[PDB]
Amino acid sequence: EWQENKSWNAHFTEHKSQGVVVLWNENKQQGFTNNLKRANQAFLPASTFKIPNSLIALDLGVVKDEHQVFKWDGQTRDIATWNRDHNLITAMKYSVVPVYQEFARQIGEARMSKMLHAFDYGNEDISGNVDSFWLDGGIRISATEQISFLRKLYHNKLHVSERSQRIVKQAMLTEANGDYIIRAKTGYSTRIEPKIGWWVGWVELDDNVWFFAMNMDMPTSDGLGLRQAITKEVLKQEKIIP
Amino acid sequence: WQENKSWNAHFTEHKSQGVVVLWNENKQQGFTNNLKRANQAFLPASTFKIPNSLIALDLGVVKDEHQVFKWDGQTRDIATWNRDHNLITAMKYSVVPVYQEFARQIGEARMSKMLHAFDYGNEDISGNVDSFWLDGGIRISATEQISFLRKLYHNKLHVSERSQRIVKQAMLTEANGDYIIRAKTGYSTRIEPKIGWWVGWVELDDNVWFFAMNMDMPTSDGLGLRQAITKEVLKQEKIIP
């Protein structure tokens, strides 16, 4: 069950933003959102797709491990951090699209589609073709669907090996300290309206895990840090993090 | 294997005595303030939770990082111990009693073989099966810790890849956009000299810096210096901001 807490809207309002945050309390098997409607609206996953894309690439052997280097092709792209060599960890961290497009090509459309279906991932539509569908094709996923997917990953219940899932959860590591561990993935969908930012993942506490998936309208790149800030503004309000 | 005696200031500043050892994985170069003490072997104390975890996982004594180890209802000096734990929280709170139970279940034969297979320190588990890393015969130097950690990082220890991955998960101490630290503290109080340890590594985008430090720890008061000193050293070396 899901509970709407419209008070979280203040965190969007304060930052002159519109969006949804969805939380799931694993112990209590309860979910919370500021906007049930938008929680169930599907959007392009953009770089959040790196999570399933990694799982599949690892499981098929397209990526041997998290150390394998994927050389910069020497083509300066807009994003400075992309113009360097990468492995899975840093490719995830810096959302290095070109690396994952190459994975997607090597995976191919048949295996990609089968695996997404096996994952129950979003609308499971990769039209098309292989190497951009999460950016400007047909694949869409809602925040509540992201939670469902993430929960399976956390529990190693996705239809790939345990190793693949552990490696991807490693690669998702975003922040940790004595109070919490956040494993998550950002996304930024720009190719198709509405432009949105994502942050999906979970917060590991000593005794519980809180899954989250947020997206928000992102008319310009200026607002990208709000993905995390608003999520954390909500996590703080809910005493999940200090 | 450079000695940089300038890092001694980081110990002197805190009226402390100790050693920090760094290993730059890419350059295959090590650095320390004190080559002698870098090679001096001490009780590992709770840094032993790293190999103890690996062995427990690999033998099935620990099924996974979620398995709960119920508190035995004995209230001890450390509050966080007086509660149920899994591998992650047991490592985080250095829950000795949990790992003593693992050690008992592992037993002396398998413990000894495994430490040899790990090339771990002096590989000597003389003493109580469930306390030898606290007050038995096992000794390991900072440089030996680095050697062991390097094998762990590369999944080259003689246990399954899964075991090594889980323990590296459990070692997670700190992460942000600049670095990840996977590490384990220790505090050897039973047998003189009382020392504190911090051993692990810092993962950067491009490189991994292994570290192992220990320092005299006459009282618990100084325990935060383990991390503080290591981090000022890391900061001086521009490894972390």
Curated annotation (Swiss-Prot), chain B:
According to its UniProt record, the EC number is 3.5.2.6
What SUPFAM superfamilies would the database entry show? beta-lactamase/transpeptidase-like
> How would you summarize its activity regulation?
Inhibited by avibactam, related diazabicyclooctane (DBO) derivatives and by bicyclic boronic acids, via a covalent binding to Ser-46. Inhibited by chloride, bromide and iodide ions. Not inhibited by the beta-lactamase-blocking agents, clavulanic acid or tazobactam.
Q: What class of enzyme is it?
A: hydrolase
What InterPro entries does its record include? Bact_Transpept/Beta-Lactamase, Beta-lactam/transpept-like, Beta-lactam_class-D_AS, PCN-bd_Tpept
- Tell me the superkingdom of the source: Bacteria
Q: Name one GO molecular function term.
A: penicillin binding
Any one of the GO CC terms: plasma membrane
Catalytic activity as recorded in UniProt: a beta-lactam + H2O = a substituted beta-amino acid
Annotated a beta-lactam binding sites? 46, 49, 94, 226
Q: Example GO biological process term?
A: antibiotic catabolic process
Q: According to the UniProt record, list the residues that bear N6-carboxylysine.
A: 49
What's a Pfam family in this record?
Transpeptidase
Mind listing the UniProt keywords for this protein, alphabetically? Antibiotic resistance, Hydrolase, Plasmid, Signal
**PTM note:** Carboxylated on the epsilon-amino group of a lysine, with the resulting carbamate functional group serving as a general base. Probably N-carboxylated at Lys-49 at neutral pH in vivo and undergoes complete N-decarboxylation, at pH 4.1, in vitro.
PANTHER family for the chain: BETA-LACTAMASE YBXI-RELATED (PTHR30627:SF6), PEPTIDOGLYCAN D,D-TRANSPEPTIDASE (PTHR30627)
Function comment: Class D beta-lactamase which confers resistance to the beta-lactam antibiotics, including amoxicillin, and moderate resistance to cephalosporins and carbapenems such as cephalothin and imipenem; in the DH10B strain of E.coli. Acts via hydrolysis of the beta-lactam ring. Has oxacillin-, cephalothin- and imipenem-hydrolyzing activities.
User: Which proteins does it associate with, and in what oligomeric form?
Assistant: Monomer. Dimer.
What other facts are recorded?
Answer: When OXA-48 is present in clinical isolates of K.pneumoniae, increasing chloride concentration during antibiotic treatment reduces bacterial growth.
Q: Which family does it belong to?
A: Belongs to the class-D beta-lactamase family.
Q: What is this protein called?
A: Beta-lactamase OXA-48
Q: Which organism is it from?
A: Klebsiella pneumoniae
The major lineage groups are: Bacteria, Pseudomonadati, Pseudomonadota, Gammaproteobacteria, Enterobacterales
